[model samples]
Target: GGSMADKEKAEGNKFYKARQFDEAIEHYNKAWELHKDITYLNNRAAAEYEKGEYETAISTLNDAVEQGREMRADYKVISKSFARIGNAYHKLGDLKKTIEYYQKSLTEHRTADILTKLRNAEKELKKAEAEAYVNPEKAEEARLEGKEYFTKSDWPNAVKAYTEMIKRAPEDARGYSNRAAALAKLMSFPEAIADCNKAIEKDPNFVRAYIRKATAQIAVKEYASALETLDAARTKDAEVNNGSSAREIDQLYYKASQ
Candidate 1:
């Protein structure tokens, strides 16, 4: 006496109760195909979700929400679909969309579970924003302090300030390169070479790091090593010693040759 779609929905419910999610989804799909019922669509989305098919669940939930609206389905049905969509987005690492849809669900029919999800999403979004936040003023202050110390020829203070700048903006090569100069002035040749290496690592095309390295190497009487470094610089970048550039590298090369 049951209709075909009703019979299929009953089978789907049986599979769902047994935790056979994939089978439940298949049966739910058959019911949806026969009757285009919002219940079948919602059931299929939830089943797909339980099987770790979050992407598929998201798509199906969207369909169910749209269909629920078109058929003037109950507000609770549409709200439940929106909450499920938010859950799927949360699993996919999308905090913004998760917060958005959860809020929309709450507007339709406030539920404790949807409110909990909304709060969690908002907390995660705030944490993510905090992690990405940087204070530009702090970075600029460190840079200015470092430059002032360098101008005063205060090698120790210059190194400290530049270290702070490096921490503030780890990706900036200038801090490493400038600190190399201060370390070289202090006759810390090996440490200067290490800083130059870090500067070059941060910016491979930085001509100043190669020059600084060669200077420190020549100071340490590493003539052969200095020549090799200068040669690589010249070969990689002809502009490194084209005119005034050539003067710096050539001067080092001549000293190394001696």
Candidate 2:
């Protein structure tokens, strides 16, 4: 006796054309036993795609290609499967992987659709990269401007200048720490403390940031927290700021206990 595997496969194909993807896959799963045909896999993947299941679609295609290798599929099926994977990644917004699979597809056999998709992916990738570009030189200019303002005791513009420094080089700790200094001078202790937090997050080892934060906490009468922060700074270096930092911590400890 023979199994009616291909019969259910054709039935699933009918459901796929009707856009009944759930039932389509439902039938495909039944057909998958002892079927192992590429068409069977493709129809289920098509159902996955139609449901906007881009990630699942890629997984299904990967499973199929692994089996395709086992079955030693022809270029006809293999390249098409590759292109389907390319399209899935494209839909999922992964341009690099999209181009990779499309190129693999082209290596096996040429398809106009995959070629078009690959070209568009390359363009989008180039445009996205250009838009995300950073500029360290501009950030340096802002830092110098902020430093000059801070030295001249113009706390207001010092904040503005370092705000731009942060905008230009958000990854750097110096901008936030410098701004925290000026913000503290302006008696905006809470805001100053927030920027000090950002500075510490950006550079956990920057003892200067910990010092500024501890001093501000003492000013706000949060003696317990100030003591904790001073202890953390001391752990970073027993003799930072020419041992003056150690002296300051000793003085703060005496003041907090009083």
Candidate 3:
């Protein structure tokens, strides 16, 4: 029996075939008001999606899935809505949800198109996860470049290299400590002390950070702070059994005291 809804749905399909998605949606909405059929809802979602209305497409597809389940539609029909939902989510950069709905669609029927979508989603997710993970090899390379600049007494280029190293390995303290040395050579005592503090924050027992901090403090005429920093380094040296470095700290303490 051809009802009013069926007539309107046919018109919607004609408009959709002509690539007039706005007209298709209008007829689909009319068909939906008449019969509330899942097909009409799914077609409307497809129209919206083709028009780049991804959020609306997702919402319409969700409604189709819910109403189709309530109507006890064929499993393949329900799965089609799920697949549409997955497509909408993928367009929105939601790979996890895209994968989920595509997997659900596969459980109903192993469609080649759905299988392809699922595989693509998995690849994108894998790449994004890899990008988020830190790789320290580049950081080491930058640190070596900074060391070369240091050996040549090129303070400005040394700072540039160490800054790149810090950007590559923010959690590694060595870059910050080395950058502090370059800044100290340029007579930027305050900035050097700040970098030393950052290094110390990352590795509280890093003896070089304490030594650099003390050196910067002395350069800035903070004699008391220098003495305190030297004592902290001396304590760390004792803990690590640095016999000669401990004696060197004693000499630094005498100079700072004067």
Candidate 4:
């Protein structure tokens, strides 16, 4: 039995060395059935990772660490497993889980490479948290000026402030998008479509641009083009939303296109 387990483990290692990860996992599974060894299980988890079975790899790495702890085996191997599992969770889009496992590994191991990975994962998690939501605020002066010109239907001055916002903050998709909205309201259908194009350039993922451009297209009597733009907007929203709700009053627009 030991001889067979050893042979299977050897074959698994050879397959893994050759990058035949599927075959390697198969042999590792057989070896574990016979021996239930930590090293074999660790390699199995590693092979599963190459196959993009991230969650499974994470569970298997846990098993490897547990077994090592029970057997009074090397802590170095356990620490390495934990680090790998943390990185795997990151790739799986489980940022919270990634940070947890990384911290666990850090307690057992303080390797420079693992420290760098943990810090990077923490930075990304913070960034993701920060992007949750932002309430748009207009300064009192700007708001008063905007209301004055907009209520009077003064197209030129309304366009000026909106355009200035876009030029000053090209990275802020909302700026260009709002300017496009103002242009639409002012009945400048052609200029509205131009501003929508500018917004799209700044944010390829800006779903609003599609709707704005489609609205302008309709105002310009490009019915079929408007439909195409609408489709594009929907596609972009779906891509970024991951099937979440993309429609709200905040996203509606009037028709204009050229």
Candidate 5:
């Protein structure tokens, strides 16, 4: 067992290559205990961080900073450790701590790579702050406002109103499907088809979304695609497509096949 630390670290690298992060951490940990090397500790923490164990990485890295300094470790080594601390917090969504540690690493040595981390961390904080203002009540108000415009048959205003609903709640499938119907009324077949796709993906198996999608395809004479969508819709739910829906499918099919 000559140089067991190096042997353990080599074994760690093998586990890392195999994507067995837990085993990698254990072997790296064995190397750390053997030599008390910051490099070994950092490798263990790397596995922990990649495995989504952010707290464990932070704990291990902070320990590395303290004990590593006791051994007179290089500033570059400490800086990398600090930079990794920032990475851990950044992924955990604690941008405040992320920026702090990144700033600390920059003070150690102004590396361009870590500089970019600080810049990105700052932007994410701003983006999260802006998203914090999203209000579902506003989304509800905008939705009914779209409905009012739709009733007036004012295709332009209805699109605008529904667009407002989408901006208010981009997660809401209703806004996209509604805007698709409005766009169809405006005879903008391409835009209608685009919106129908978003609506369908956001809430699959919605009967109206399929109908609207096929209707737009028929307008553009994308007959093959329209037939497939209509075909799938009928098979998805026989009862939902049974009424006037069946007749529309019949006519659209007859029109396209001819």
Candidate 6:
């Protein structure tokens, strides 16, 4: 004789796996109220997530994680829940919160998928940090200059700031990355490719470098070379990340197909 709560939880789990989140949430809420257990809470959180109730999902996950601390469910659900929350924040363009949850997830799970996302988020965060990176005293002045120059479509000023960034941080791959972007904005394909090459030499695992390089190669009509580069990037960490190595790898395939 099974309890009604157990039956509701089992049905909720089944509905969740079937992608019927609304139905899953209904049963999960029933089960949670009846049993007041972490398992039901976890399922409810997952259901809420699928329905796009991110804040509720995060709160529910937190409750489940806190109560399930002594069990294996602590790590398993926490890692996945944090990863989901981080991804949602990323989609929302809240980079700071995205980095927060991503790092929190990594503390519980050191999987390659988690590490790769964390690394990419860090890169984007650093790029955004460039506002404060150039010069503290001249920050406001530079912002005005950037805005004015950007409005005028002045490629030279863009290139100048980009070049200065590269000169100041010769060791960081981002300098080359930014320079490549500026050069590409000016339609300087070869120069952009060269800068991208410099970035790749600095960090072979850099995703943006491969993407920019492939774009330049396509601009030069080197379709075969672009495809080869993408293949290499995708295969670079396929072993550890379960084919999650390349973020823009599909663009390469799409280009090749065209």
Across residues 139-163, which tens digit of lDDT does each residue of candidate 1 receive?
A: 6788899889989989999999888
1-258: candidate 3 lDDT, tens digit per residue = 248999899999999999999999999989989886788888999999999999999898888888888898788888898899899999999989999999999997789999998998999998786566545988899999999999999999999999988877888999999999999999999999999999999998788888888988988889989998998898888786564487667777887988
Worst 10 residues of 6 by lDDT: 136-145
Q: Rank the candidates by TM-score, best first.
A: 3, 5, 1, 2, 4, 6
Task: List per-prediction Cα lDDT, in the order shown.
Answer: 0.87, 0.86, 0.90, 0.77, 0.87, 0.76
Which candidate has the highest TM-score of all?
A: 3
Clashes of 5: 0
Over 4 Å off, model 2:
1-3, 134-258
Candidate 6: stretches off by over 4 Å = 1-6, 34-36, 70-73, 130-258
lDDT of 5 by residue, 1-258 (tens): 339898999999999988899999999988987887798888888899999999999999999999888999988888999999999998898989999999999998789998998998899888886577456998899888888988999889999988878877888899999999999999999999999899888877677888888888989989999999888767654765355467766776787687
RMSD of each: 11.4, 13.4, 13.7, 14.1, 8.5, 16.9
Q: Which stretches of candidate 1 lie over 4 Å from their true place?
A: 1-4, 134-258
Model 1 misses residue 30 by how many Å?
A: 2.4
lDDT of 4 by residue, 102-152 (tens): 888888877888788888988998777655422234333444465567778
lDDT of 6: 0.76
Using lDDT as the yardstick, the better of models 3 and 4 is 3
lDDT of 5 at 117: 86
**Which residue pairs come into collision in candidate 2?**
none
As for candidate 1, its clashing pairs are 241-245, 241-246
Model 6: per-residue lDDT, tens digit, 1-258? 139899999999899999999999999888878875667877787788778787787777766677667554657566877787787677668889888988888898877887899899989999877744555434334444544665677877967765665645555686676668667778899999899999889877777677788887888888888898777667764744567646567866687669
